[PDB]
UniProtKB/Swiss-Prot annotation:
Keywords: Capsid protein, Helical capsid protein, Host cytoplasm, Host-virus interaction, Hydrolase, Inhibition of host IKBKE by virus, Inhibition of host innate immune response by virus, Inhibition of host RLR pathway by virus, Interferon antiviral system evasion, Manganese, Metal-binding, Ribonucleoprotein, RNA-binding, Viral immunoevasion, Viral nucleoprotein, Virion, Zinc
Highest taxon of the lineage: Viruses
Binding site for Mn(2+): 30, 32, 174
One function term, GO molecular function aspect: identical protein binding
Subunit structure: Homomultimerizes to form the nucleocapsid. Binds to viral genomic RNA. Interacts with glycoprotein G2. Interacts with protein Z; this interaction probably directs the encapsidated genome to budding sites. Interacts with protein L; this interaction does not interfere with Z-L interaction. Interacts with host IKBKE (via Protein kinase domain); the interaction inhibits IKBKE kinase activity.
Gene symbol of the encoding locus: N
Protein name: Nucleoprotein
Included range, full protein: 360 to 569 of 569
Binding annotation for Zn(2+): 40, 147, 150, 170
Amino acid sequence: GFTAGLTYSQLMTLKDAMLQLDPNAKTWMDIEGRPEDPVEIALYQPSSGCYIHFFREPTDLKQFKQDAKYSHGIDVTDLFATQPGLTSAVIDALPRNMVITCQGSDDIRKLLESQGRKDIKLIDIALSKTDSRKYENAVWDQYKDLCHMHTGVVVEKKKRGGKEEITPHCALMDCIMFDAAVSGGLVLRAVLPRDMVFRTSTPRVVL
Ligand SMILES: [Zn+2]
């Protein structure tokens, strides 16, 4: 038995980082991509400002391209360097019986259950679409430097008329804006090291 993808030292570094979480603080979680094949993951604790944020290369390119066009605007080339096994290792390290808050619990439930974490309790805050996006503009304005990965034009599917571009959906900004909507208004600290979420790329001769 073992944790796939990460070597032991990486794993102990992650384990130590994860202990920066307050196990009882309100904790948001949000993902981009389907729960069976997620490409962006974020957890957020407003009280401390602690956030977990990382990415994953998709298994299904076809579905990913649809999601990029209509939801997240992420370019797969920026995902080539992601750390294999990171999603499983992070979720394994979440405190037992932790209470996690989300907007729509269905996808979060599926993802956690696929990791054998049925012990985690979910609160679906169930915001209207409109209510959930009240602080969208404000959040991107203040925190855009925390995520540069949404590079593609994202559009609304329309039956008629002109093209309509929309603001891309980011797991991290989602957490922040759903929390602002709940708290009636709007620093932050990264839990994970940058060299853990992305493997440093280096030159090679193709063999
Ligand atoms: Zn993002």
